[PDB]
Amino acid sequence: VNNTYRSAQHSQALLRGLLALRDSGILFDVVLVVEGRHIEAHRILLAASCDYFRGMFAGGLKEMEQEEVLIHGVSYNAMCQILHFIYTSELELSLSNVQETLVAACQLQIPEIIHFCCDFLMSWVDEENILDVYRLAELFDLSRLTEQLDTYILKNFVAFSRTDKYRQLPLEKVYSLLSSNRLEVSCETEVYEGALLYHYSLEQVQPKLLETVRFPLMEAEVLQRLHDKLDPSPLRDTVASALMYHRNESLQPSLQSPQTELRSDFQCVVGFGGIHSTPSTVLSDQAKYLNPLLGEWKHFTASLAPRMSNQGIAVLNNFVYLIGGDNNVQGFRAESRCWRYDPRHNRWFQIQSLQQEHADLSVCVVGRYIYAVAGRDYHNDLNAVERYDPATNSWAYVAPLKREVYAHAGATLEGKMYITCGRRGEDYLKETHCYDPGSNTWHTLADGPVRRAWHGMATLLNKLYVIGGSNNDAGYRRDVHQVACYSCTSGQWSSVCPLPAGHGEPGIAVLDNRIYVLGGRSHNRGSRTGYVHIYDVEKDCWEEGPQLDNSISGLAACVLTLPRSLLLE
Amino acid sequence: VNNTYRSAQHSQALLRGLLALRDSGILFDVVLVVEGRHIEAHRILLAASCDYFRGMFAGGLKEMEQEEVLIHGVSYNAMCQILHFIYTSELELSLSNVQETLVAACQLQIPEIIHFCCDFLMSWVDEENILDVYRLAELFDLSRLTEQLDTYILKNFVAFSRTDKYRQLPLEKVYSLLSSNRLEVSCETEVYEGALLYHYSLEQVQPKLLETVRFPLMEAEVLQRLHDKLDPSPLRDTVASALMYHRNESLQPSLQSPQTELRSDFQCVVGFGGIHSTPSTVLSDQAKYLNPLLGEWKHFTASLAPRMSNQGIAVLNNFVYLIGGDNNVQGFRAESRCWRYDPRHNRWFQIQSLQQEHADLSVCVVGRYIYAVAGRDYHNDLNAVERYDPATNSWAYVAPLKREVYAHAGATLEGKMYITCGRRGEDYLKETHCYDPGSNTWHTLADGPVRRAWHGMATLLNKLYVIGGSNNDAGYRRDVHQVACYSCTSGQWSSVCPLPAGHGEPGIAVLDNRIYVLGGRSHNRGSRTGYVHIYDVEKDCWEEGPQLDNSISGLAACVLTLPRSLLLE
Amino acid sequence: KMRIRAFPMTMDEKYVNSIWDLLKNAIQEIQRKNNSGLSFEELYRNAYTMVLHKHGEKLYTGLREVVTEHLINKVREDVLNSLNNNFLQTLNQAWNDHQTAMVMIRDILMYMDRVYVQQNNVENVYNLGLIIFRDQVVRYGCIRDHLRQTLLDMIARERKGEVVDRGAIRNACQMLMILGLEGRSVYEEDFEAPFLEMSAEFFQMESQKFLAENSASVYIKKVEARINEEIERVMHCLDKSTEEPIVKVVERELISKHMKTIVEMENSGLVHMLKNGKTEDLGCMYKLFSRVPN
């Protein structure tokens, strides 16, 4: 046995001793002549602290045999500050020695001082000297400052729009900033006014910069008024294009345009609609969405409120769609109407109704139409399978079930529609058939190791993963607490920890490349789903996420990107 | 502004640079010759690391003008290790050069390396060379080693007693170890065997130590057998006296002695008696303690446990006694008999008291007697204050109470009983009576913050703090979450941490300045309270304490030093 | 299998005694300002050797005896010789030399102060040197006297209007405050009382002269000038700690003890100002009376 002991409070003691020695004024060896003044210090600390000093003092050049070293181009106060930082690990900054310190720290190539000076400069950035800051940053080739100046200019676009220097910005830079998605404005008219102010004088107002304006995100009811007073320009055609787009409520996902993007960043899982089980024994009708930013089931838009329990869920170009429904565990309520919620327009519309009002199956959104693998009725086995394209309103025949499967589970593994195991009604079986989108037929695939049904099958790490289920594996029409899944795409079993709550007709969504379980009825577990756990892909374990306050069973949740403007207010 | 920054990763970078410079073998300026071998080093690092080098290189002596420095009386490997530690802050030890490193470290007076060497040596402590360790720690005067060496001795006494070195140990150290209440032993028979082995040769087996032998710790039969087997000597007289004392267990708290106590520090709160609401409020006969060493609800069997609830618990000479005790759960009737537990004797004998026509009363033991004031009837108010005689354990008369109260609040504040709150008849009185035991009469006291009834009183900062309470007279039969400390010394209701849970008649227990309240009946919840709150007056931090497995009301608990075996199992 | 290596212990008196003679010679050489040739490793090794064999009592007693003998026979005679003229400079030089010698001696014997002193709970080397210097130099029967008369003399000269070396006064005050080893006990004992007494007497005489000389406005101007002078003297020559007792005496003598004189003052009193209706005089009187309670 040898054993190694390492201290932690020794380096700071050494630094304190060195500082005391320097304050005493002994063992000094080298003197630096800066701006005609002498500063006296030690060779070894300077050589071991920076890299320029290391090169000067241990590089084999003349400074080996020279008592004094005369520096050029650096201010005396800058050297005093640098030496104080070296000896004391602290740094004192003001509004008068910050410009001359950055110059000296950028020349000797010390990163910590440069970072501290950049932070201090950003602590006093205003709209009166921002051009000077940009010039200084670009002169010294700094890239940690012109990645925070853009943040400031985006966070205060309206305030800076009134500045006279705003028109002095380069056209390319302002065009890039306007086209960015982090710029927050409640409308799409203020950006147009700012672009006009940049391009034309205020009196003249009251080009290419207008290309960044998101017309489909603006109100189409002001388009007619704008076009009447619009100057002769091809912008009239663009305005009229918005009128044609507004008449495509059932084709808005199909009519997606690069200028129809959502100028925001908020992607998460929204759970609205369904039938709440506990503590309210009534079917939910108001459509509210839980905000992941706030980590609570706060209020949200009541877009596409479905009057069904455990309805379908699809996401076509950031647009949610729902059709069907089945809650056979607690009373099935099948629906035939399909409802679409557009986050881009933040509105609701009647989506194209499915050919058969069937649910309790798996739906994969692949190709031009989302296709259902296998299929069943609300509470019984059925062969009604079809592919739905609400954007194109195309209800087409899909591959039927190769074997009698009801309330089965599936996921889009490697972008291919596939299902794992199944149930011929109540009897669970391991027969799995993957419907090839290219061949439009249920091709044979690897059978699921666990004969689970009515479970939440998702794709994690491009691998199929099913947690829980409602089949004969639990001995009755209950939820199996054991978790066992085998990914055919990965070709191996990916064992996971048992679900804290039984996944019986629950809503399973994947956020941040991590699936989660929330809601459901767990008859075998002896309690309801009063907790929500997310299975981290990297950790390979389930961590207790934001538990739902209501132990509901049969409520579907979608995952999509929502307007961050609403979350910000 | 003038904000100042301070990094935290600068010292390690400096040390790494210094190590790199040393490895490169450049900028060396001093050479140390030890026993004829040369080592290269930097003057400033040595001068700013320890104090021996600081004086040698900075005091002003001849060493200012020497290139090589002679060092005598030290090992070359020791200096290599020391320099490695200085340049690295990580020190590698072994089983061969540990003595050289330790002696070199003690030579130069460096604390961290001394502590590391001591820890390594104790981690590799040798049984055959413990005397060589005491000699080493004595010549160098290492007072930080001897204490935990003795601590090690007191936990491995049985194994070391077999070795002859136990006889070789000095008499003073052996006596100090034996007298210490930390030896890991089960019965006094092992102590007697060790004393015999110290006072006689091993072959002979096959006085002073007997002074530390706890004679009453043995059984009566064992004592009688030892006395019969002992030759005529004063040790036999002492054994006879111990047997007689053990034959007077009824006078156990009146026969306290330094050898009549246990040897441990397991101060814990043990709940005994009372009524547990689950599944029915009956007078329990089992001890439900909250073991901190085990950190859980430990169970024990209290011998001679009377069928009483909310009885005043008096802890004298490590012996607990119950006074009064209302049994309104099993029928309101005062009990004159008393029950006593003897944790010191690992048993319990019900030492019945005299006629005490009072309930929910506590007596502060002042001298051979105990003074008590106020009191309550079986279910209503009473003023029959009864004092106690610990010598005979007799419930005799006391000074008359100022007024009759029911379920009042009472605490012995610096040898002076204070009674506040309480229920005169049905009406909850707010008058405060300061019955000082020295004055033997009521005096002025701070009025209760809440004019309610059935409110427990705790001893917080040597003050009668009133918290909780559950009565309609407080305004409503709701939980009173506001807690104020009625400091009699300050004579005011000082602000205290609000009570997280409101429950009247809750049992209090102070464990290291942590006056937790548990049990009782909560009027807001309409049932007994099964939760405790851990709050510290000095730390001002209140949180959730240990939670009982079953809600109880009108229970009794007390903090006392229990046997070490009980805390270890 | 620790396998503790054996090591011998010896206490041969002659060998121990020779080490003491060498250490005494080294200490005497240091005290004579001849440290430039003395080695360090040998002395520290010897000092470590004396503590390893439990001989710390001899070391402490010898150090005390040597320090006392040297300080007496090489400082007291010098100060008495320089008693007449050049008194402050030689005292300051001796103080500085003693401080340097003691700090060097402490630097040599860190092991003793780190082991033996903490073991037996005695004064360290620096504290012992300060105690000896206080007992045998500053608090001598005549040196303390002459120090007090000369200090009060320069104080009186500064009060009159002469020029004195404020730096020397500040250095003397700092040395006196340091010589307590914990605070201002010696500073209060030897310096505060005579200074307060003389200041009180001088202020009483000045207040009587001002009251007998002119009206209340001149008294206000004089007391303001005295306040400015004393607040400048305390902030430059004297120590800042001795501020409140001075202003207390000033208020109790130049203001309170003449308050009745300001009560019955003519042509500048409250009645005279009210009859004239002036406001600057009333403001000056209010400012003067604000400092003095009641």
JSON list of N, CA and C in Angstrom, two decimals, chain A residues 1-7 10-11 14 18 26-27 42 44 48-49 58 86 89-91 93-94 112 120 124, chain B residues 1-7 10-11 14 18 21 26 44 47-49 58 86 89-91 93-94 112 116 120 124:
[
{"chain": "A", "resi": 1, "resn": "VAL", "atom": "N", "xyz": [0.83, -1.19, 0.00]},
{"chain": "A", "resi": 1, "resn": "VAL", "atom": "CA", "xyz": [0.00, 0.00, 0.00]},
{"chain": "A", "resi": 1, "resn": "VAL", "atom": "C", "xyz": [0.87, 1.25, 0.00]},
{"chain": "A", "resi": 2, "resn": "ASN", "atom": "N", "xyz": [0.62, 2.15, -0.95]},
{"chain": "A", "resi": 2, "resn": "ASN", "atom": "CA", "xyz": [1.40, 3.38, -1.05]},
{"chain": "A", "resi": 2, "resn": "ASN", "atom": "C", "xyz": [0.53, 4.59, -0.73]},
{"chain": "A", "resi": 3, "resn": "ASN", "atom": "N", "xyz": [-0.56, 4.76, -1.48]},
{"chain": "A", "resi": 3, "resn": "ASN", "atom": "CA", "xyz": [-1.55, 5.82, -1.28]},
{"chain": "A", "resi": 3, "resn": "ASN", "atom": "C", "xyz": [-0.97, 7.20, -1.59]},
{"chain": "A", "resi": 4, "resn": "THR", "atom": "N", "xyz": [-1.76, 8.04, -2.27]},
{"chain": "A", "resi": 4, "resn": "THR", "atom": "CA", "xyz": [-1.35, 9.39, -2.62]},
{"chain": "A", "resi": 4, "resn": "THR", "atom": "C", "xyz": [-2.31, 10.39, -1.99]},
{"chain": "A", "resi": 5, "resn": "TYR", "atom": "N", "xyz": [-1.76, 11.36, -1.29]},
{"chain": "A", "resi": 5, "resn": "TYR", "atom": "CA", "xyz": [-2.55, 12.42, -0.67]},
{"chain": "A", "resi": 5, "resn": "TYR", "atom": "C", "xyz": [-2.33, 13.73, -1.41]},
{"chain": "A", "resi": 6, "resn": "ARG", "atom": "N", "xyz": [-3.42, 14.41, -1.74]},
{"chain": "A", "resi": 6, "resn": "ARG", "atom": "CA", "xyz": [-3.37, 15.67, -2.47]},
{"chain": "A", "resi": 6, "resn": "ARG", "atom": "C", "xyz": [-4.15, 16.73, -1.71]},
{"chain": "A", "resi": 7, "resn": "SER", "atom": "N", "xyz": [-3.53, 17.89, -1.52]},
{"chain": "A", "resi": 7, "resn": "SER", "atom": "CA", "xyz": [-4.17, 18.99, -0.82]},
{"chain": "A", "resi": 7, "resn": "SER", "atom": "C", "xyz": [-5.02, 19.81, -1.79]},
{"chain": "A", "resi": 10, "resn": "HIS", "atom": "N", "xyz": [-3.51, 24.52, -0.68]},
{"chain": "A", "resi": 10, "resn": "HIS", "atom": "CA", "xyz": [-2.08, 24.82, -0.68]},
{"chain": "A", "resi": 10, "resn": "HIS", "atom": "C", "xyz": [-1.71, 25.90, -1.69]},
{"chain": "A", "resi": 11, "resn": "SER", "atom": "N", "xyz": [-2.32, 25.89, -2.88]},
{"chain": "A", "resi": 11, "resn": "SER", "atom": "CA", "xyz": [-1.97, 26.86, -3.90]},
{"chain": "A", "resi": 11, "resn": "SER", "atom": "C", "xyz": [-2.29, 28.28, -3.45]},
{"chain": "A", "resi": 14, "resn": "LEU", "atom": "N", "xyz": [0.24, 29.48, -1.02]},
{"chain": "A", "resi": 14, "resn": "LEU", "atom": "CA", "xyz": [1.46, 29.87, -1.72]},
{"chain": "A", "resi": 14, "resn": "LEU", "atom": "C", "xyz": [1.30, 31.25, -2.36]},
{"chain": "A", "resi": 18, "resn": "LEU", "atom": "N", "xyz": [3.48, 34.59, -1.56]},
{"chain": "A", "resi": 18, "resn": "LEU", "atom": "CA", "xyz": [4.15, 35.37, -2.60]},
{"chain": "A", "resi": 18, "resn": "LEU", "atom": "C", "xyz": [3.72, 36.83, -2.55]},
{"chain": "A", "resi": 26, "resn": "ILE", "atom": "N", "xyz": [11.41, 42.18, -1.07]},
{"chain": "A", "resi": 26, "resn": "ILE", "atom": "CA", "xyz": [12.66, 41.44, -1.05]},
{"chain": "A", "resi": 26, "resn": "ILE", "atom": "C", "xyz": [12.61, 40.35, -2.11]},
{"chain": "A", "resi": 27, "resn": "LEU", "atom": "N", "xyz": [13.80, 39.86, -2.47]},
{"chain": "A", "resi": 27, "resn": "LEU", "atom": "CA", "xyz": [14.00, 38.83, -3.49]},
{"chain": "A", "resi": 27, "resn": "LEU", "atom": "C", "xyz": [13.55, 39.29, -4.88]},
{"chain": "A", "resi": 42, "resn": "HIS", "atom": "N", "xyz": [9.46, 39.75, -9.78]},
{"chain": "A", "resi": 42, "resn": "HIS", "atom": "CA", "xyz": [10.19, 38.49, -9.82]},
{"chain": "A", "resi": 42, "resn": "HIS", "atom": "C", "xyz": [10.12, 37.88, -11.21]},
{"chain": "A", "resi": 44, "resn": "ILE", "atom": "N", "xyz": [10.45, 34.53, -11.97]},
{"chain": "A", "resi": 44, "resn": "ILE", "atom": "CA", "xyz": [9.86, 33.20, -12.05]},
{"chain": "A", "resi": 44, "resn": "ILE", "atom": "C", "xyz": [8.35, 33.28, -12.16]},
{"chain": "A", "resi": 48, "resn": "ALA", "atom": "N", "xyz": [6.12, 31.93, -15.31]},
{"chain": "A", "resi": 48, "resn": "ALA", "atom": "CA", "xyz": [5.18, 30.84, -15.14]},
{"chain": "A", "resi": 48, "resn": "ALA", "atom": "C", "xyz": [3.72, 31.28, -15.20]},
{"chain": "A", "resi": 49, "resn": "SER", "atom": "N", "xyz": [3.46, 32.59, -15.26]},
{"chain": "A", "resi": 49, "resn": "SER", "atom": "CA", "xyz": [2.08, 33.07, -15.26]},
{"chain": "A", "resi": 49, "resn": "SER", "atom": "C", "xyz": [1.52, 33.20, -16.67]},
{"chain": "A", "resi": 58, "resn": "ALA", "atom": "N", "xyz": [12.23, 32.74, -20.80]},
{"chain": "A", "resi": 58, "resn": "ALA", "atom": "CA", "xyz": [12.70, 31.37, -20.85]},
{"chain": "A", "resi": 58, "resn": "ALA", "atom": "C", "xyz": [12.79, 30.89, -22.29]},
{"chain": "A", "resi": 86, "resn": "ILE", "atom": "N", "xyz": [-1.88, 39.26, -11.33]},
{"chain": "A", "resi": 86, "resn": "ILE", "atom": "CA", "xyz": [-1.02, 38.09, -11.24]},
{"chain": "A", "resi": 86, "resn": "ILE", "atom": "C", "xyz": [-0.75, 37.75, -9.78]},
{"chain": "A", "resi": 89, "resn": "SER", "atom": "N", "xyz": [-4.76, 37.54, -7.87]},
{"chain": "A", "resi": 89, "resn": "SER", "atom": "CA", "xyz": [-5.84, 36.82, -8.53]},
{"chain": "A", "resi": 89, "resn": "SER", "atom": "C", "xyz": [-7.13, 37.63, -8.63]},
{"chain": "A", "resi": 90, "resn": "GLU", "atom": "N", "xyz": [-7.12, 38.89, -8.19]},
{"chain": "A", "resi": 90, "resn": "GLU", "atom": "CA", "xyz": [-8.27, 39.77, -8.30]},
{"chain": "A", "resi": 90, "resn": "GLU", "atom": "C", "xyz": [-8.00, 40.82, -9.37]},
{"chain": "A", "resi": 91, "resn": "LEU", "atom": "N", "xyz": [-8.98, 41.69, -9.60]},
{"chain": "A", "resi": 91, "resn": "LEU", "atom": "CA", "xyz": [-8.84, 42.73, -10.60]},
{"chain": "A", "resi": 91, "resn": "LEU", "atom": "C", "xyz": [-9.84, 43.84, -10.32]},
{"chain": "A", "resi": 93, "resn": "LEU", "atom": "N", "xyz": [-11.59, 47.32, -11.71]},
{"chain": "A", "resi": 93, "resn": "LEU", "atom": "CA", "xyz": [-11.90, 47.97, -12.97]},
{"chain": "A", "resi": 93, "resn": "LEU", "atom": "C", "xyz": [-12.75, 49.21, -12.73]},
{"chain": "A", "resi": 94, "resn": "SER", "atom": "N", "xyz": [-12.61, 50.19, -13.62]},
{"chain": "A", "resi": 94, "resn": "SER", "atom": "CA", "xyz": [-13.36, 51.43, -13.54]},
{"chain": "A", "resi": 94, "resn": "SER", "atom": "C", "xyz": [-13.78, 51.82, -14.95]},
{"chain": "A", "resi": 112, "resn": "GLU", "atom": "N", "xyz": [-8.12, 35.33, -19.35]},
{"chain": "A", "resi": 112, "resn": "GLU", "atom": "CA", "xyz": [-9.01, 35.67, -18.25]},
{"chain": "A", "resi": 112, "resn": "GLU", "atom": "C", "xyz": [-9.24, 37.17, -18.15]},
{"chain": "A", "resi": 120, "resn": "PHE", "atom": "N", "xyz": [-17.09, 43.50, -18.25]},
{"chain": "A", "resi": 120, "resn": "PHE", "atom": "CA", "xyz": [-17.25, 44.84, -17.72]},
{"chain": "A", "resi": 120, "resn": "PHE", "atom": "C", "xyz": [-17.74, 45.81, -18.79]},
{"chain": "A", "resi": 124, "resn": "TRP", "atom": "N", "xyz": [-21.69, 48.10, -19.35]},
{"chain": "A", "resi": 124, "resn": "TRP", "atom": "CA", "xyz": [-21.93, 49.52, -19.58]},
{"chain": "A", "resi": 124, "resn": "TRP", "atom": "C", "xyz": [-22.09, 49.84, -21.06]},
{"chain": "B", "resi": 1, "resn": "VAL", "atom": "N", "xyz": [-19.73, 52.29, -12.35]},
{"chain": "B", "resi": 1, "resn": "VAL", "atom": "CA", "xyz": [-19.44, 51.61, -11.10]},
{"chain": "B", "resi": 1, "resn": "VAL", "atom": "C", "xyz": [-17.98, 51.19, -11.06]},
{"chain": "B", "resi": 2, "resn": "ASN", "atom": "N", "xyz": [-17.59, 50.51, -9.98]},
{"chain": "B", "resi": 2, "resn": "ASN", "atom": "CA", "xyz": [-16.22, 50.06, -9.76]},
{"chain": "B", "resi": 2, "resn": "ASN", "atom": "C", "xyz": [-16.20, 48.60, -9.35]},
{"chain": "B", "resi": 3, "resn": "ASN", "atom": "N", "xyz": [-16.92, 47.76, -10.10]},
{"chain": "B", "resi": 3, "resn": "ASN", "atom": "CA", "xyz": [-16.97, 46.34, -9.79]},
{"chain": "B", "resi": 3, "resn": "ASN", "atom": "C", "xyz": [-15.59, 45.71, -9.92]},
{"chain": "B", "resi": 4, "resn": "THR", "atom": "N", "xyz": [-15.30, 44.76, -9.04]},
{"chain": "B", "resi": 4, "resn": "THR", "atom": "CA", "xyz": [-14.02, 44.06, -9.02]},
{"chain": "B", "resi": 4, "resn": "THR", "atom": "C", "xyz": [-14.27, 42.57, -9.19]},
{"chain": "B", "resi": 5, "resn": "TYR", "atom": "N", "xyz": [-13.50, 41.94, -10.07]},
{"chain": "B", "resi": 5, "resn": "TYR", "atom": "CA", "xyz": [-13.62, 40.52, -10.35]},
{"chain": "B", "resi": 5, "resn": "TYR", "atom": "C", "xyz": [-12.54, 39.75, -9.60]},
{"chain": "B", "resi": 6, "resn": "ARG", "atom": "N", "xyz": [-12.73, 38.43, -9.52]},
{"chain": "B", "resi": 6, "resn": "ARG", "atom": "CA", "xyz": [-11.77, 37.56, -8.84]},
{"chain": "B", "resi": 6, "resn": "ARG", "atom": "C", "xyz": [-11.93, 36.15, -9.39]},
{"chain": "B", "resi": 7, "resn": "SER", "atom": "N", "xyz": [-10.91, 35.67, -10.09]},
{"chain": "B", "resi": 7, "resn": "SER", "atom": "CA", "xyz": [-10.95, 34.33, -10.64]},
{"chain": "B", "resi": 7, "resn": "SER", "atom": "C", "xyz": [-10.65, 33.30, -9.55]},
{"chain": "B", "resi": 10, "resn": "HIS", "atom": "N", "xyz": [-6.81, 30.45, -11.16]},
{"chain": "B", "resi": 10, "resn": "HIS", "atom": "CA", "xyz": [-5.51, 31.04, -11.46]},
{"chain": "B", "resi": 10, "resn": "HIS", "atom": "C", "xyz": [-4.37, 30.37, -10.72]},
{"chain": "B", "resi": 11, "resn": "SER", "atom": "N", "xyz": [-4.60, 29.96, -9.47]},
{"chain": "B", "resi": 11, "resn": "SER", "atom": "CA", "xyz": [-3.53, 29.36, -8.67]},
{"chain": "B", "resi": 11, "resn": "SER", "atom": "C", "xyz": [-3.07, 28.03, -9.27]},
{"chain": "B", "resi": 14, "resn": "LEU", "atom": "N", "xyz": [-0.96, 28.59, -12.30]},
{"chain": "B", "resi": 14, "resn": "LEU", "atom": "CA", "xyz": [0.38, 29.03, -11.90]},
{"chain": "B", "resi": 14, "resn": "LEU", "atom": "C", "xyz": [1.22, 27.86, -11.42]},
{"chain": "B", "resi": 18, "resn": "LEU", "atom": "N", "xyz": [4.66, 26.42, -13.07]},
{"chain": "B", "resi": 18, "resn": "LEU", "atom": "CA", "xyz": [5.88, 26.24, -12.28]},
{"chain": "B", "resi": 18, "resn": "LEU", "atom": "C", "xyz": [6.41, 24.82, -12.41]},
{"chain": "B", "resi": 21, "resn": "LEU", "atom": "N", "xyz": [8.01, 24.42, -15.78]},
{"chain": "B", "resi": 21, "resn": "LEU", "atom": "CA", "xyz": [9.33, 25.06, -15.80]},
{"chain": "B", "resi": 21, "resn": "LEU", "atom": "C", "xyz": [10.37, 24.21, -15.09]},
{"chain": "B", "resi": 26, "resn": "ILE", "atom": "N", "xyz": [14.95, 24.68, -16.46]},
{"chain": "B", "resi": 26, "resn": "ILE", "atom": "CA", "xyz": [15.42, 26.01, -16.82]},
{"chain": "B", "resi": 26, "resn": "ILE", "atom": "C", "xyz": [15.07, 26.98, -15.70]},
{"chain": "B", "resi": 44, "resn": "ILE", "atom": "N", "xyz": [12.61, 31.56, -4.80]},
{"chain": "B", "resi": 44, "resn": "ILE", "atom": "CA", "xyz": [11.39, 32.26, -4.40]},
{"chain": "B", "resi": 44, "resn": "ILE", "atom": "C", "xyz": [10.31, 31.28, -3.96]},
{"chain": "B", "resi": 47, "resn": "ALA", "atom": "N", "xyz": [11.13, 30.10, -0.55]},
{"chain": "B", "resi": 47, "resn": "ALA", "atom": "CA", "xyz": [10.99, 31.18, 0.42]},
{"chain": "B", "resi": 47, "resn": "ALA", "atom": "C", "xyz": [9.54, 31.55, 0.68]},
{"chain": "B", "resi": 48, "resn": "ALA", "atom": "N", "xyz": [8.63, 31.23, -0.24]},
{"chain": "B", "resi": 48, "resn": "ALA", "atom": "CA", "xyz": [7.23, 31.60, -0.09]},
{"chain": "B", "resi": 48, "resn": "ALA", "atom": "C", "xyz": [6.33, 30.40, 0.17]},
{"chain": "B", "resi": 49, "resn": "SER", "atom": "N", "xyz": [6.90, 29.25, 0.52]},
{"chain": "B", "resi": 49, "resn": "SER", "atom": "CA", "xyz": [6.12, 28.05, 0.79]},
{"chain": "B", "resi": 49, "resn": "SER", "atom": "C", "xyz": [6.06, 27.71, 2.27]},
{"chain": "B", "resi": 58, "resn": "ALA", "atom": "N", "xyz": [15.32, 34.81, 3.27]},
{"chain": "B", "resi": 58, "resn": "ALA", "atom": "CA", "xyz": [14.83, 36.18, 3.37]},
{"chain": "B", "resi": 58, "resn": "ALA", "atom": "C", "xyz": [15.18, 36.86, 4.68]},
{"chain": "B", "resi": 86, "resn": "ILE", "atom": "N", "xyz": [5.67, 20.36, -2.84]},
{"chain": "B", "resi": 86, "resn": "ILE", "atom": "CA", "xyz": [5.64, 21.81, -3.01]},
{"chain": "B", "resi": 86, "resn": "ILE", "atom": "C", "xyz": [5.30, 22.16, -4.46]},
{"chain": "B", "resi": 89, "resn": "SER", "atom": "N", "xyz": [1.53, 19.87, -4.97]},
{"chain": "B", "resi": 89, "resn": "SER", "atom": "CA", "xyz": [0.45, 19.82, -3.98]},
{"chain": "B", "resi": 89, "resn": "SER", "atom": "C", "xyz": [-0.18, 18.43, -3.89]},
{"chain": "B", "resi": 90, "resn": "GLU", "atom": "N", "xyz": [0.49, 17.43, -4.44]},
{"chain": "B", "resi": 90, "resn": "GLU", "atom": "CA", "xyz": [0.12, 16.03, -4.27]},
{"chain": "B", "resi": 90, "resn": "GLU", "atom": "C", "xyz": [1.34, 15.27, -3.77]},
{"chain": "B", "resi": 91, "resn": "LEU", "atom": "N", "xyz": [1.15, 14.50, -2.70]},
{"chain": "B", "resi": 91, "resn": "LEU", "atom": "CA", "xyz": [2.26, 13.83, -2.02]},
{"chain": "B", "resi": 91, "resn": "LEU", "atom": "C", "xyz": [1.99, 12.33, -2.03]},
{"chain": "B", "resi": 93, "resn": "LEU", "atom": "N", "xyz": [2.91, 8.68, -0.67]},
{"chain": "B", "resi": 93, "resn": "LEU", "atom": "CA", "xyz": [3.51, 8.01, 0.48]},
{"chain": "B", "resi": 93, "resn": "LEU", "atom": "C", "xyz": [3.77, 6.54, 0.16]},
{"chain": "B", "resi": 94, "resn": "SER", "atom": "N", "xyz": [4.41, 5.86, 1.10]},
{"chain": "B", "resi": 94, "resn": "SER", "atom": "CA", "xyz": [4.69, 4.43, 0.99]},
{"chain": "B", "resi": 94, "resn": "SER", "atom": "C", "xyz": [4.87, 3.89, 2.40]},
{"chain": "B", "resi": 112, "resn": "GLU", "atom": "N", "xyz": [0.55, 20.50, 6.89]},
{"chain": "B", "resi": 112, "resn": "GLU", "atom": "CA", "xyz": [-0.24, 19.63, 6.02]},
{"chain": "B", "resi": 112, "resn": "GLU", "atom": "C", "xyz": [0.42, 18.27, 5.84]},
{"chain": "B", "resi": 116, "resn": "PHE", "atom": "N", "xyz": [-0.90, 14.58, 6.98]},
{"chain": "B", "resi": 116, "resn": "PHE", "atom": "CA", "xyz": [-1.01, 13.48, 6.02]},
{"chain": "B", "resi": 116, "resn": "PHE", "atom": "C", "xyz": [-0.24, 12.26, 6.49]},
{"chain": "B", "resi": 120, "resn": "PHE", "atom": "N", "xyz": [-1.78, 8.58, 7.41]},
{"chain": "B", "resi": 120, "resn": "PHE", "atom": "CA", "xyz": [-1.31, 7.36, 6.76]},
{"chain": "B", "resi": 120, "resn": "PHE", "atom": "C", "xyz": [-0.83, 6.34, 7.79]},
{"chain": "B", "resi": 124, "resn": "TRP", "atom": "N", "xyz": [-2.30, 2.63, 8.63]},
{"chain": "B", "resi": 124, "resn": "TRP", "atom": "CA", "xyz": [-1.44, 1.45, 8.61]},
{"chain": "B", "resi": 124, "resn": "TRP", "atom": "C", "xyz": [-0.86, 1.20, 9.99]}
]
